[PDB]
Curated annotation (Swiss-Prot), chain A:
Gene source species: Homo sapiens
Tissue expr: Expressed in the temporal lobe, frontal lobe, parietal lobe, hippocampus, and cerebellum. Also found in kidney, lung, liver, heart, skeletal muscle, placenta.
Residues with glycosylation annotation: 45
Effect in UniProt of substituting residue 243 to I: In HYPOC1; increased G-protein coupled receptor signaling pathway
Record's protein name: Extracellular calcium-sensing receptor
Segments of this protein annotated with the region Intracellular loop 1 (ICL1): 88-99
Residues of the full protein shown: 550 to 873 of 1078
Effect of residue 215 to S: In HHC1; decreased G-protein coupled receptor signaling pathway; does not affect cell membrane localization
Lineage per the UniProt record: Eukaryota, Metazoa, Chordata, Craniata, Vertebrata
Impact upon substituting residue 214 to W: Decreased activation by positive allosteric modulators
Effect the entry attributes to changing residue 55 to K: In HYPOC1; there is a significant leftward shift in the concentration response curves for the effects of extracellular calcium on both intracellular calcium mobilization and MAPK activity
UniProtKB/Swiss-Prot annotation, chain B:
Self-association state and partner proteins as the record states: Homodimer; disulfide-linked. Interacts with VCP. Interacts with ARRB1.
Protein name stated in the entry: Extracellular calcium-sensing receptor
Domain note: The extracellular regions of the homodimer interact in a side-by-side fashion while facing opposite directions. Each extracellular region consists of three domains, LB1 (ligand-binding 1), LB2 and CR (cysteine-rich). The two lobe-shaped domains LB1 and LB2 form a venus flytrap module. In the inactive configuration, the venus flytrap modules of both protomers are in the open conformation associated with the resting state (open-open) and the interdomain cleft is empty. In addition, each protomer contains three anions, which reinforce the inactive conformation, and one calcium ion.
Functional note: G-protein-coupled receptor that senses changes in the extracellular concentration of calcium ions and plays a key role in maintaining calcium homeostasis. Senses fluctuations in the circulating calcium concentration: activated by elevated circulating calcium, leading to decreased parathyroid hormone (PTH) secretion in parathyroid glands. In kidneys, acts as a key regulator of renal tubular calcium resorption. Ligand binding causes a conformation change that triggers signaling via guanine nucleotide-binding proteins (G-proteins) and modulates the activity of downstream effectors.
Length: 314, 51, 51
């Protein structure tokens, strides 16, 4: 509490008035209040200054707990599918869906699920620099593996030594990696201590250096997804590999629905939970692809292996 | 109509789960905007997929 | 801007302390910042109160 002038009365006759928020008076008979220093805010009685609460998506927060559980479950499912594909690597079903491409796709799916874990926790500089590029590269690799696994994609390109499948996935991912290198070399993101949205707490955000580069990452990812969707849709009715193109189409629609929904969800989320939505979108898309590429096959491989033959896989 | 039912309900679940961090972190006009956008997305997805 | 007390110096010698948000001072040589009424906040200059 500080002194206030009682009009007419001398200096020794003063009123007592409480300090405003953000200012404090530690000692008694104070003529003015003291603003709390940077990163500090007044306490509940304006008696002293206490540190502002540092807000971010926490690992121990129940929302973060659920998101970590879902990412762990996704990694577990991807490793399970990889294990099934490895033990049954000599079966016709695993041979048909190119085993090397399936292994690389599962590696990229593990990377996709793990990349969501770079959005939980207190944002550091390197974490913010790796968030967007990690998911971008991993998902471009996924869409490249799928996009060269379908019909009328490798044929049109082929019309050295290693398969053209790997050359195509390398080029498609290399464009993304070049974009990311240009980004983190010219305008890398950083960890920003935002003290403007709220006055009693400090948000920790990832300030992306160039929104042009982030837009380029997203545009390239969506362009590859659209190419994959179109080429699978032109061949969706084909029954090869247990209707592989139909499920590729399903996965691409799941991806597009997830990100079109990500638009308003991100544009309407404030505070720490913004990182939240990112994780969910990531997870969902990954899960989609995973299911649409493997669960069916996994069934036919583990249970009722009668169709695990060259004739049935067709 | 199996895939159409599946995709309609996938749109419903995906949209409503996507807006959970918005419903738990926003107030004012924007929370009602979240409500309207989620409802419209669900209804449009169901109508499109089924019809 | 209200009048703040200089310790050890008489009443005629005061400092100019800006009114905080929510309160305001409309007159000159004011010794107290007055809070805006209910459903009313203070404008940028703290010279009046707007709804
Ligand atoms: C975030 C998590 C909860 C999503 C991961 C998906 C899983 C819940 C799995 C378990 C049940 C799976 C489904 C179980 C059954 C089918 C039927 C199957 O339909 C067929 O055309 C095959 C016909 C046959 O089985 O002979 C296609 C795969 C699908 C949709 C599977 C897709 C992936 C699903 C939904
Ligand atoms: C859609 O495919 C993708 C390709 C790369 C990254 C991503 C995800 C992981 N980040 C969304 C980026 C969202 C965003 C937009 C503007 C400013 C900040 C932010 Cl954070 C998706
Ligand atoms: C989700 O299905 C519903 C069933 C009944 C009502 C409603 C709407 C009209 N109000 C609650 C919306 C709150 C909410 C709940 C879960 C996920 C996101 C959100 Cl934003 C939705
Ligand atoms: Ca007097
Ligand atoms: Ca004196």
């Amino acid at each position: 509490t500080r002194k206030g002038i009682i009009e007419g009365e001398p200096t020794c006759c003063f009123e007592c008035v409480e300090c405003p928020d953000g200012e404090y008076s530690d000692e008694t008979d104070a003529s003015a209040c003291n603003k709390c220093p940077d990163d500090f805010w007044s306490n509940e009685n304006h008696t002293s200054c206490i540190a502002k609460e540092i807000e971010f998506l926490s690992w121990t927060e129940p929302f973060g707990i659920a998101l970590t559980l879902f990412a762990v479950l996704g990694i577990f499912l991807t490793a399970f599918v990889l294990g099934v594909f490895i033990k049954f690597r000599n079966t016709p079903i695993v041979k048909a869906t190119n085993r090397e491409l399936s292994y690389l796709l599962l590696f990229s799916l593990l990377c996709c699920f793990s990349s969501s874990l770079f959005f939980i926790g207190e944002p550091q500089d390197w974490t913010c620099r790796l968030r967007q590029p990690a998911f971008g590269i991993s998902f471009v690799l996924c869409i490249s593996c799928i996009l060269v696994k379908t019909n009328r994609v490798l044929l049109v390109f082929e019309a050295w030594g290693l398969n053209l499948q790997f050359l195509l996935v390398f080029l498609c991912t290399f464009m993304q990696i070049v974009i990311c290198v240009i980004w983190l070399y010219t305008a890398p993101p950083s960890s920003y201590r935002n003290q403007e949205l709220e006055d009693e707490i400090i948000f920790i955000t990832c300030h992306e250096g160039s929104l042009m580069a982030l837009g380029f990452l997203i545009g390239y990812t969506c362009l590859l997804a659209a190419i994959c969707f179109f080429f699978a849709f032109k061949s969706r009715k084909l029954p090869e590999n247990f209707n592989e193109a139909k499920f590729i189409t399903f996965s691409m629609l799941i991806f597009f629905i997830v990100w079109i929904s990500f638009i308003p969800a991100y544009a309407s989320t404030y505070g720490k939970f913004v990182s939240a939505v990112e994780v969910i979108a990531i997870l969902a898309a990954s899960f989609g692809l995973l299911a649409c590429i493997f669960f069916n096959k996994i069934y036919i491989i583990l249970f009722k292996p009668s169709r695990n033959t060259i004739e049935e896989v067709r």
